[PDB]
Amino acid sequence: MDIHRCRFVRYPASAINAVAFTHSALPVVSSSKKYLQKNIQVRLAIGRANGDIEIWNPLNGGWYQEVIIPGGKDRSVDGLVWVTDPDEEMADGKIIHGKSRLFSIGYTTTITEWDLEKARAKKHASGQHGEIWCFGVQPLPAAQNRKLVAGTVDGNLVLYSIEDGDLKFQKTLTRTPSKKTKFVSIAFQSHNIVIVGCSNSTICAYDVRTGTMLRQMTLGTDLTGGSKNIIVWAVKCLPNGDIVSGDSTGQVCIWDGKTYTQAQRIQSHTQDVLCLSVSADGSKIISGGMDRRTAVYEPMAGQSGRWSKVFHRRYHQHDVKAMASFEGKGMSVVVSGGSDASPIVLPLRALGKEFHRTLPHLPQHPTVLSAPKARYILSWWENEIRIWHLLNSAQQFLPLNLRKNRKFLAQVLIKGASHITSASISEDGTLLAASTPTDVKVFHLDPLYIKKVNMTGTGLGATRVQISPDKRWICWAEEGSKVMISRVHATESADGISYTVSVPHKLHRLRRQIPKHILLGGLGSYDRNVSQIAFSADSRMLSVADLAGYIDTWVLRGPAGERWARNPKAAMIPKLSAAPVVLSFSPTPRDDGDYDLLVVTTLKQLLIFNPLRGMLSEWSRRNTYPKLPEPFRDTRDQVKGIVWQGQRAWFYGVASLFMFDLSQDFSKRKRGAHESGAGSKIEKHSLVPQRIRAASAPDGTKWEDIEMVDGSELQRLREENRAKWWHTYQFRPIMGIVPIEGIPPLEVALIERPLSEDDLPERYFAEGEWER
Amino acid sequence: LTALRHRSALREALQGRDELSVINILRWAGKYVADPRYRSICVDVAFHLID
Amino acid sequence: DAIEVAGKVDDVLLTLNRLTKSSAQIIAYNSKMLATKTGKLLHTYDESPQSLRSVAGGRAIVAAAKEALHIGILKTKKLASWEELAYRFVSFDVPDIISTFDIRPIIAELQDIDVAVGGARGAIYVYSNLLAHLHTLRVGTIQPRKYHWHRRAVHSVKWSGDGNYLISGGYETVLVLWQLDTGRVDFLPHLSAAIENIVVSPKGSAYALHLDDNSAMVLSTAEMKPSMYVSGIQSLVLGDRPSKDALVRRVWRPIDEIASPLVATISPQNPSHMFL
Amino acid sequence: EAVRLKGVIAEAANYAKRARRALADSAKGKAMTVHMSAELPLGLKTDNKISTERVRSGGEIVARSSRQIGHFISKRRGIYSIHRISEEMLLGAAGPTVVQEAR
Amino acid sequence: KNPKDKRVGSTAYRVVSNGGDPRLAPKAKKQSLNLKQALLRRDRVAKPRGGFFV
RNA sequence: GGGGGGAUGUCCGGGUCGCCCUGGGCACCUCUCCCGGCAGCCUUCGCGGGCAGCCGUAGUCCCGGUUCAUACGUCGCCGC
C-alpha cells in the first residue's frame, strides 16, 4: 500500500460557541432498574461559529457525531437550549419520555427552533427588540406551560411561549432604565426567579410572574486594567440556592441565595471567565476562561458556603467559550468547547483521577472523496468544492517534482447562501453532485470545463448523495429520512457526452416495528434519517442505513425498464446494536452472484452480510466480537471509513489505521474497570492518592489495602463448520483516506489536518497578562 | 544587551521575531559594530541572528 | 510532646531511627523510659523516611515517607495506662516528593488536622481534613488542593496562626502568603537569600525566618520589616542535610562542594573586622 | 587568504559532517529534513534527532513520552510526502520509505 | 439582495423583501457580533500572528 | 564509538560454477563486553562498597502534548 500524505487541504476550524446537553441529569436507579432508562435518548448539541449545529451521542463513552446541520453564509450560532418535558405515563404504566426540542439564537432578534427529524430549522420567532444575546428555558416546579426568557442588547427581557409545537413572542417582562445595559448571561434560580448578568457591572435578579425586580447585585471596578465596567459573562445557580458568577476580572463570585448578596470572591483566572458549569448534586464548579484555563472548585471543609479552587489546568489551545455538564446512566462528564474546535470531555466525579478526552475537530463523515480512475481528490466546505489532480504515480518518485505533483485543479463555488451538506463524484470524475439543504446540484466536468446539469423535480435539499459506479443512478436522502433516486441518461454526440437527469423516482423504505411510546417520546422520528448510502460495485444493489441501526437494501430489476425493487430478504437484515459508522459492499465479486456488505458499527462490531441470502457470512459466523484484536477493540476512536483491497480491508478512524486480512481468522486499557465517560484511569501522576494502606501490627509486617470508593456450545458448531492484521497510530489527525489507481497494489491519499495557531484566531493580551 | 548576556537570555530575546524586526536588529548591529566600545556585544547579537 | 500518662502530663519523645537504609521505625520514650533505654515501638515504614511531627498533645502523629504520608491516631482515649500507647496508622501516597509539611490542629479535644505538604516539584498540596476522612475497608475520595507558585522545590510551608493564611518560602528568595479565603496571593519578594526555614510566633504577630545566607530575621506582620536581625559568617559550607531541591534531578544538580578557598582579609585600622 | 579559506572550509566541513549524520539517520528511517541536491542550502541547518529528555519546570529533567515524540515528528513532516508502506512492514520487520517535498 | 427603493419625490415605491430566509436560518447581525467581540477585547492588543512573513 | 562474530544487498580477478567464498569496497538487523547517564534495594554516621538493573532512541486507547514568574509604602513641576 503506497501512501500520499496530504496536509494542503486547509479545512476550516470553527469556534464552538454553545454546548447543550439534552438532559442535565438523570435520576439514579439501581442495576435491577437498569431497563427503565434504556430508551432515554441523551444527545449533545454543539453549535459552532459557522452556524453548524451538530448532534453528538455520548454512547456510554463512545461519543459518536451523528448529524451536522450547517447554517448559511454569514450565519453563526451563539446559544443552544434543549427543552425536555417530564415523563408522561400511559394508561398501562408504560413511560413516554419527554420530547426534547432544540432552540437556538444566531446573534439576531430571532429565536430559531430546529427540526432534527428533517435536519433543518423548524420555526422562527422574533419581536421588536434588540439582538438576543442569552436565553434559557424556565425550570420545572408549569407542566405543559413552559416559557423561554431571553435577554438582549438594549435591555428588555423578552419572554417567548412554547406549548403544543409553538414558538411565539409572548411579551416583554421589563427593561433597564439605562439604554447602555446589555444582557450577556441568564440562569434561573427557581421556577419564578431569573438571574441575569449585565454589562454595567450588575447581576440583576428579576421575578418572572409579575416581572418585578428582587435585588440588583453589583460588582466593583476592575482595578487590573482600564475599562471600569466589569462584565458578568456567566451566571449559574447551585441546587441549594446560591448563585455562581464568573465575570470580566476572571473572578468567580458566590452570591447568597436568600439575601442576594455576595458571600465569596475567588480570584481564579487572569483573563475573564467565559463559562461556568455546576455539578448536578452541587458539589463541583468548573470555570473556563479566556486564558485557556479550566479551574475546578470544591467546598471548603468546615464552614458552609465557602468554596475554594482545588486545581486548574489549561486543557484547550484557545479560550473556553462554552461548556455543559451531564450526570446520569453511570456517566458524569462536562464537555467544554472553545475556539480551537475541539470539544474536550472531562470526567466530573473522577476529576483528577481519570484522563480527559479531546474529541476530533474534523467531522465524522470523511468529507474527502476521490475519482481514482481520474485521480481527482475532492473536498468541500462552506460553499466551495476544491478538486485536486495528482498527475503522476508514487513509483515514479522513487523531491523537486513533488511540488509539481499535486495541482490545485478546480474550485467550484455554489450559488445562493446555503451550505454544501454532502457531495459525490463518479469514478472517472466527469459527474459531480453536491447537496445543500435547499437544492441538489449536479455538475458535468470535462478535462477544465464545468457545466451545470439541469436538475428537475428536486428543490427541498438532501443530506447524502451517491452516484453509481456505472454513472447511471443518482441517489440522495431528501429531508434526511426520504431516500430518493433518479436515472441519468447519457447521450453521446459529435461534441462529446451530455447528461440528462430524470424525474426523481422515490423508493419506499420498510415499515419497521417500533412501539408507540418510543415513537412519541425521545427525539421522535430522529433516528430514521439515513447516515450511509452505499451502492454495490456493479450498481445492481443499493443499501442505506440510518442512526437507529436499520439497514434497508434494494435490488435492480431490469427490462428504460430498469427499476428498483425491495429485497425480499430485507426484513431478515436485523437492527444493529448501535448506529453503523461504515457500510459498503465488497468490490471483489463472489461466486454465487451474491454480495458481501461490510458493516462496522460504533461499538467496534465488524461484521459482513450476505444480503441476498439475508444472513451473515460464514466468516462472520466464525469471527465474533471477542475474536477481534485488542488494538482494534480498545481504540476509543470511531472508525471514520474503510478502503478496500482484495482480501484486505483497511480501516481508518481519526487517529488509528488498520488492515485486516478478511480471508484468515483471528485468535494497556483495562476491560473490567468501570470508569466515567471520558478516558481511562490514571496511572502515574495524579492529585488523588492511589495506594492507601492501613497498618495493624506495629512492627509493620501486616498491612491492608483501603479502597477509596464513594457460547461454549455455539462455538463447537461454529468451529466444526471449517495472522495478517496490522495497526498504526503514526497518522494522527486523519480527516480522510481515499484510494487512487493509475492483493493488488493500491495508491492512497491520506489527508490530515493538524491545527495551527495560524488557523486558530488571534489571542488577545493586555499589558498585565502576557503568557510565557 | 549586556544585561541580556549576563542573564542568559539573548537567544530568547532574539528567537521570536518576524521579518521587519529582524531587519531592525540587523540594522542596529550593522550601524553599531563600528564602535569598539560595544563591538563584543554587537558581534554576539549578530552571531545569534545569523544562527 | 506533652502527654498524660496517668494524671501527670510529661514529655514523651518520638524518635525516628533507621533499621535499614530505606526503612525506619518510630519509637517513643519517657524520661524514666529513656533512663533504661527501652522504647515503645509504634510503627516501621519502609520508603526512605524523612521526618516526623505530631499535633498538640500526642493524639495524632504525622510521619513522612518520600512519596507517602503516614497519619497515626492514638487508639484509646485518655491514655489510662502506659502499656496501651498504640497508634493506628494509615498511609497514602502524596503526588510529589515531600520536602516539608506543616499540620495544624482543628480544635480541648482534637477534631481534625489540616496538612500542608510542600513537595519537591514546587507545589503545595493542602489536604483539608484527614481524621474525618480516615476515621471511617472503605474511605471517601480525598483530593488535595494544589497551590503552585514556586519554580524549584518549596523549602518551608507553614499555616499562620488563625489558619486564614498559608505562608511559604522557596529558592526564589520570596516569602509568599496564600490568602486561602479568596484565591489571591501576596508576597514579600526580594530577600537576600533562599527562605530556608520559617516559624510563626506563639501569638499571631511575628514570623521568624532562617535565611540561607546564615541569617535569622524576626519579622512583624504587616509592618514586614525585620524587628530582629542576626547574621553569621555566611561562608561556604559542606551541608549536613544536603539540599531540598537536589531531590528531583534538575539541569544542574546542587552538589555540596568547596572548589576554592574563601577570599578574606582581616582589615588593618580595625583588626576586629574581617572583610570576606 | 588562509583566514578566508579557513572560515569557509571549516563551516562547509562541519555542515558536511552533521549532514552525513542526518542522512544516515534518514536512511535508517527517522524521517528528518535533509537537502537533496548537491549545492549548499542557504541556512546551513540540519535537523537533529529529538532528545530523549524534557526540561520541566522549574528546571528538572524527565523522560520524553513517545506521544510527545510523535507530536514533534508530526510537526517535522511537510505539506506533501509519499510514505510507502512495505509488505515487510505489514509483516512487522522493516521500516517505510519516505520522500517528502523539499521546503 | 433587495432592490433599492425608487422615490418620486413625495412617495417611495418599494418591493417587499422576505425571500432571503426560506427555512434555513436568519442571517447574523454583523453589528451585534462585532459588539460582543469588542466587549471581549477591551484595550488588549493581539500578539504577532504568524512566523517569518511580510 | 571500538573490539569482534551470525545475516541482509552489491561490482571488480573470479571459481567445477554454486552453496557463496577468498582479495578490495562496503550500508543495515542481531549478539557480545568497555563508554556516558539514570534510577531502585542491602551495608556504613558519612566516605565509599555490593546485588539484579534500565536508557543513549522513535509516532500514542484516552493521556504530563500538562503544572511554573518576584509586592506595598505618593504623585506632579522646575532648578543645581
Following DSSP, what letter does each residue of E2-54 receive, concatenated?
PPPPEE-SS-EE------S-SSS-PPPPHHHHHHHHHHHSSS-EEPP-SSS--
Q: Which three cell numbers stand for residue A153?
A: 442588547
| C-alpha closest to that of C256 among C234, C274, C241, C275 | C241
> CA of C249 vs C1' of F38, distance in Å?
9
Q: Do A399 and D100 make contact, defined as CB atoms within 8 angstroms?
A: yes
Rounded-to-integer distance, Cα A310 and Cα A293, Å: 13
> CA of A47 vs C1' of F66, distance in Å?
27
Q: Identify, with chain letter, the residue nearest to nucleotide F8 (CA–C1').
A: D94
- For C94, nearest residue in chain A (alpha carbons): A689
> Beta strand A541-546 with A551-557: parallel, antiparallel or unpaired?
antiparallel
Number of H helices, E strands in chain C: 2, 24
- Do residues C231 and C214 make contact, with C-beta atoms less than 8 angstroms apart? yes
Which strand F nucleotides have any atom less than 7 A from protein CB atoms?
27-29, 38-44, 46, 55-72
> CA of A587 vs C1' of F28, distance in Å?
40
Nucleotide nearest to C95 (CA to C1'): F67
Rounded-to-integer distance, Cα D83 and Cα D73, Å: 14
Report chain E residues whose CB lies below 8 A from the CB of A71: 24-25
Q: Do D60 and C151 make contact, defined as CB atoms within 8 angstroms?
A: no
Q: Do A110 and E26 make contact, defined as CB atoms within 8 angstroms?
A: yes
Candidate from E23, E28, E50 with C-beta closest to A76: E28
Rounded-to-integer distance, Cα E50 and Cα A373, Å: 39
- Do residues C122 and D57 make contact, with C-beta atoms less than 8 angstroms apart? yes
- Do residues C132 and C142 make contact, with C-beta atoms less than 8 angstroms apart? no
Question: In this structure, which amino acid lies at residue A4?
Answer: H
Rounded-to-integer distance, Cα A740 and Cα A429, Å: 12
Rounded-to-integer distance, Cα A128 and Cα A320, Å: 32
- Label residue A130 left, alpha or beta by phi (over 0 means left) and psi (-120 to 50 means alpha): beta
- For C91, nearest residue in chain A (alpha carbons): A693
Q: Which residues in chain A (315-354) have CB-CB distances under 8 A to chain E?
A: none
| C-alpha closest to that of C238 among C217, C259, C264, C209 | C259
> Beta strand A747-752 with A2-6: parallel, antiparallel or unpaired?
parallel
User: Chain D: nearest CA to A591, how far in angstroms?
Assistant: 28
Rounded-to-integer distance, Cα A71 and Cα A417, Å: 9
**Cross-strand pairs, C185:** C178
- Do residues A81 and A135 make contact, with C-beta atoms less than 8 angstroms apart? yes
Report chain A residues whose CB lies below 8 A from the CB of D78: 7
Rounded-to-integer distance, Cα D95 and Cα A586, Å: 30
- For A688, nearest residue in chain C (alpha carbons): C143
Q: Tell me if chain C has a CB within 8 Å of the CB of D91.
A: no
Q: Which three cell numbers stand for residue B43?
A: 558581534
Resolution in A: 7.0
- Do residues A755 and A11 make contact, with C-beta atoms less than 8 angstroms apart? no
Report chain C residues whose CB lies below 8 A from the CB of D59: 151-152, 250-252
- For A418, nearest residue in chain E (alpha carbons): E24
Q: Do A301 and C129 make contact, defined as CB atoms within 8 angstroms?
A: yes
Chain A contact probe: residue of E2, E21, E23 with most A CBs at under 10 A: E23
Q: Do D80 and A399 make contact, defined as CB atoms within 8 angstroms?
A: no
What DSSP character marks residue A167?
-
Q: Tell me if chain A has a CB within 8 Å of the CB of E43.
A: yes
Report chain A residues whose CB lies below 8 A from the CB of C44: 698-701
Q: Tell me if chain D has a CB within 8 Å of the CB of C122.
A: yes
Q: Which residues in chain D (37-56) have CB-CB distances under 8 A to chain C?
A: 55-56
Question: What distance, in Å, lies between the first and last C-alpha atoms of chain B?
Answer: 17
Question: In this structure, which amino acid lies at residue E31?
Answer: Q
In the block, residue with C-alpha cell 516528593? C97
In the block, residue with C-alpha cell 477585547? E41
Q: Do E39 and A437 make contact, defined as CB atoms within 8 angstroms?
A: no
Strand locations in A539-676 (E): 541-546, 551-557, 563-566, 580-585, 597-601, 606-610, 615-616, 641-644, 648-652, 657-661
Q: Do B19 and E52 make contact, defined as CB atoms within 8 angstroms?
A: yes
Nucleotide nearest to A678 (CA to C1'): F62
Q: Do A402 and D102 make contact, defined as CB atoms within 8 angstroms?
A: yes
Report chain A residues whose CB lies below 8 A from the CB of E45: 764-766
Rounded-to-integer distance, Cα A734 and Cα A364, Å: 11
- Label residue A755 left, alpha or beta by phi (over 0 means left) and psi (-120 to 50 means alpha): beta
Report chain A residues whose CB lies below 8 A from the CB of D95: none
User: Chain E: nearest CA to B18, how far in angstroms?
Assistant: 5
Report chain C residues whose CB lies below 8 A from the CB of A301: 112, 128-129, 132
Say which residues have a Cβ less than 8 Å from residue A700's Cβ, sequence separation at least 6: C25, C43, C44, C45, C46
Report chain C residues whose CB lies below 8 A from the CB of A693: 90-92
DSSP assignments along A409-439, one per residue: EEEEEPPSS----EEEE-TTSSEEEEE-SS-
Q: C245 by DSSP, 3-state: which? A: coil
Nucleotide nearest to A683 (CA to C1'): F63
Are there at least 3 beta-carbon pairs closer than 8 Å between E and A? yes
DSSP assignments along C154-204, one per residue: EEEEEEETTTTEEEEEETTS-EEEE--SSS-EEEE---SS-EEEEEE-SSS
- A240: enclosing H helix or E strand: none
This structure was determined by cryo-EM
Candidate from D70, D82, D84 with C-beta closest to A730: D70
- Do residues C146 and A311 make contact, with C-beta atoms less than 8 angstroms apart? yes
Q: Do D79 and A7 make contact, defined as CB atoms within 8 angstroms?
A: yes
Q: Do C150 and D58 make contact, defined as CB atoms within 8 angstroms?
A: yes
Q: Which residues in chain E (3-42) have CB-CB distances under 8 A to chain A?
A: 20-30, 32-33, 35-36, 39-42
Nucleotide nearest to A357 (CA to C1'): F62
> CA of C23 vs C1' of F40, distance in Å?
14
Task: Report phi then psi at E40, rounded to 5.
Answer: -90, -35
Q: Is the peptide bond before A338 cis (omega within 30 degrees of 0)?
A: no
